[PDB]
Amino acid sequence: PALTKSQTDRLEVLLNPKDEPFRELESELLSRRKKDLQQIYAEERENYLGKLEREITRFFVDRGFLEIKSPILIPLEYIERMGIDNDTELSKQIFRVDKNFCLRPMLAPNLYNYLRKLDRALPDPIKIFEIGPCYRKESDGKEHLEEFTMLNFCQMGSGCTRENLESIITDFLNHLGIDFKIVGDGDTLDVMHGDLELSSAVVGPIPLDREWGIDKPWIGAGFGLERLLKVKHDFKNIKRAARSGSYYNGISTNL
Amino acid sequence: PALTKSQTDRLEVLLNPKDEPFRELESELLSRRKKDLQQIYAEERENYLGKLEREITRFFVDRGFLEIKSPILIPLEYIERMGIDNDTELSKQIFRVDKNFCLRPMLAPNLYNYLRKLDRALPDPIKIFEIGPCYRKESDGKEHLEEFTMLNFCQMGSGCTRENLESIITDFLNHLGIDFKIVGDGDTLDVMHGDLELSSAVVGPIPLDREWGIDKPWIGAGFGLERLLKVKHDFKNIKRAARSGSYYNGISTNL
Ligand SMILES: Nc1ncnc2c1ncn2[C@@H]1O[C@H](COP(=O)(O)OP(=O)(O)NP(=O)(O)O)[C@@H](O)[C@H]1O
Ligand SMILES: Nc1ncnc2c1ncn2[C@@H]1O[C@H](COP(=O)(O)OP(=O)(O)NP(=O)(O)O)[C@@H](O)[C@H]1O
Ligand SMILES: C[C@@H]1CC=N[C@H]1C(=O)NCCCC[C@H](N)C(=O)O
Ligand SMILES: C[C@@H]1CC=N[C@H]1C(=O)NCCCC[C@H](N)C(=O)O
Ligand SMILES: [Mg+2]
Ligand SMILES: [Mg+2]
Ligand SMILES: [Mg+2]
Ligand SMILES: [Mg+2]
Structure with a gap:
């Protein structure tokens, strides 16, 4: 019964x-x-994740941001250089490869390198973004994926104000049609959807910049694409939005 | 002087x-x-690699192929199941992660899983493709990258002939504007540009299919995107086409 x-x-x-x-x-x-x-x-x-990546790409390219594609496999040294020591949570979430490399848990290191290098060639302000796979060992499975996709955009030089940053975030999410709230948490903000964190954003400069050869103000934010899809499609479990052999655009492939 | x-x-x-x-x-x-x-x-x-991925996506989606995005981090068991034992070259090129996983050295395993699962829901023939990062430890550096991007398309069921396969390869490369020659090497063919291998293609069925629960004829081919860019842009070293912090669309970032 x-x-x-x-x-x-x-x-x-x-x-x-x-x-x-x-x-x-x-x-x-x-x-x-x-x-x-x-x-x-x-x-x-079209696959939901692939399509969202393309839609996000167009949004930023159209707003003056240079599209970056950097290595997913990075030197372990980058992690240390990001100020991630055995005192933070992330230190234990790293997927190591060989003795000197790892799967990037975020996009910031490679983007810091590009901000520094591009400043020698491009006019101010420097605007760039990258979308790609990031990896973290996680205990949660309803809001966290060990294999996920991040969008990280940033601007360095002129116009790097909290107002500009909140404006881009707002136009971005209103463009995608995702409800949100920006809340406080260098200046650090979290873009929330109910109790779900869509993004962590920051208004620099910050002490960490010196380690990367950066000495200008900047703003940036990182968004998880699977979380955006989850919210947009009303998926209860984030696994429905992940790279997977078990779901295709939210539909079970075990039929 | x-x-x-x-x-x-x-x-x-x-x-x-x-x-x-x-x-x-x-x-x-x-x-x-x-x-x-x-x-x-x-x-x-737009980044060269990102743009090429988008152009390739449109080409196949428009020709009836379903866009797949599957895990980059896969079970080590998949490697074994692909018939890659300590007797082949690839066995030693695997990047292991933890004790049970690895970075995919190819796209075939996940695509085999999708061909099997989709056959329960989709009309014949089943046409799918994926574009994404693949990883192999390599000794060469002029034609090989340890971190590269593969396109793998395939069709299963009706129309899986060598003629159909060569036709798709031909329209694909003529579309991108890349010179090539198809040569012999289940039926296995190599798409060459001079002495450079652009792709390995096969007309199934093959004995390996049984291990994946596949019992229908199929055709498929895998192309390296960095090799396509290298040829198209006349880059001498493939590193100019790779995900990197050292080149942007073939231009050095060390300025
Ligand atoms: N494991 C994950 N799975 C899916 N998305 C993630 C994951 N980790 C981070 N993200 C996304 O990436 C964004 C920026 O990274 P980050 O600010 O470091 O997240 P976090 O601080 O790890 N968030 P959280 O773990 O939910 O408290 C997050 O706001 C999420 O949108
Ligand atoms: N290490 C690599 N770097 C860049 N591209 C690669 C690499 N390995 C394979 N590819 C590309 O992926 C395609 C399909 O994979 P596969 O047929 O296994 O290559 P292979 O047999 O390893 N070719 P090769 O190593 O040049 O003799 C190849 O034809 C290349 O276009
Ligand atoms: C390249 C910039 C400068 C350093 N941080 C980069 C940035 O844009 N930071 C803003 C926050 C991004 C998301 C954060 N890295 C995370 O993983 O949660
Ligand atoms: C999913 C199909 C069936 C098994 N092989 C997949 C395929 O399309 N094979 C054709 C050859 C692809 C390239 C090869 N996997 C390589 O890595 O060189
Ligand atoms: Mg976390
Ligand atoms: Mg956060
Ligand atoms: Mg090889
Ligand atoms: Mg080959």
Whole structure:
């Protein structure tokens, strides 16, 4: 009569935010999910994460930011240089590769290097951004992924005010159609969606800049793309938005 | 009088394929490279690798292929399951992470999983592709990167003939404007540009398919994006096309 917890878990996997006797309930949902995949295959054919990356890219390129693609595999030394010592949480979340490298847990190091180098060639202000995979060992699984995708944009030189930063964040999220609230937490702000952190943003300069050969004011923010998708598509578990073999655009592939 | 080898190396770093007393030669090139970066920043602002990924995506999506984004960090078991044992070269090129995972050295495993799962929902033929980072420990540095980007497209079911495969390869490369030759090497072909391998392609089925729960004919090919850029932009060293902090769209960032 009553559905078991395992059966309910199975049906929830097949349930989409849009949906309103077990084997019958499962057959119904399976039919609907196959139809959803068939529609995607027939029309759009674009992956949610890939498409969001392209939409975000266009937004920043159009607003004067240079598109950067830097290494995902980085020197372990960069982590130390970011002020991440055995005293912070991140120190234990690092995925090491070999004895001198790791999977980047963030985009800041490579972007610091580009701000420094580009300042020798480009007119002020320097505006750049990168979107790409970042990695962190995590205990949570409902809001955190060990493999995720970050957008980090930044500007250095003129116009690096909290007002400008909040303005870009606002136009960005209103563009994507994602509700948010900017709250305080160098000047550090968090862009929240309810109790979910969409982004951490900062108004420099900060002491850390010296280690990277940076001596100008700057502003920047990092957003997790899977969290943006999660909110936008009303996914309950972030795994539905992740690179995966288990979901395609939020639809279960175990049909 | 004569330039030293080190000085020549420095000037070559600043030299672009388009270019026709050391400190003077360097000053000239530095000025030109800054101008090139300034033009990029003022107009396009798109990264070569990111843009190529977007162009390739559009090409396949438009031709009926579903865009896939799968994990870069994969189970070590996938490597074994691909028939990569301590008897092949690849076995020693794997970047291991923790005790059970690794950085994907190719896209095939995740795509095999998608072909199997999607066959339960999509009409025949199943057409999919993925573009993303792949990793291999390499000794070469002029044609090989340890961190590179692969495009792997494939079709399973109807129309999986060598003729169809060669046709897609041909339209694809003629679309990008890259000269090539298809040569023999299940049926295995190599798409060459002079002595450089652009792609390895295969007409299935093959014995390996059984391990992945695949029992239909298929065709597929894997292309390295940095090699395509290298050829298209006439870069002598592939590092000019790689994710990097040292070059931006082929222009040195050490100015
Ligand atoms: N493990 C993760 N999975 C998914 N997204 C993440 C993850 N870690 C960080 N992000 C995203 O990246 C953004 C910037 O990174 P960061 O500010 O370091 O996050 P955090 O401080 O680790 N946030 P949190 O762990 O939720 O308290 C975060 O605001 C999230 O949007
Ligand atoms: N280390 C690398 N750096 C850049 N591109 C690569 C690398 N390895 C493979 N590729 C690209 O990925 C394509 C498909 O992978 P694969 O057929 O396994 O290459 P391979 O057989 O390793 N080629 P090669 O090492 O040049 O003899 C190759 O044809 C290249 O275009
Ligand atoms: C390259 C800039 C300067 C140093 N930090 C870079 C930046 O833009 N910081 C703002 C915050 C970004 C998100 C943060 N790095 C995180 O991972 O949560
Ligand atoms: C998912 C298919 C079936 C198994 N191989 C996948 C494929 O498309 N193979 C063709 C060759 C691709 C390139 C090769 N995997 C390489 O890394 O060189
Ligand atoms: Mg955290
Ligand atoms: Mg934060
Ligand atoms: Mg090889
Ligand atoms: Mg090959």
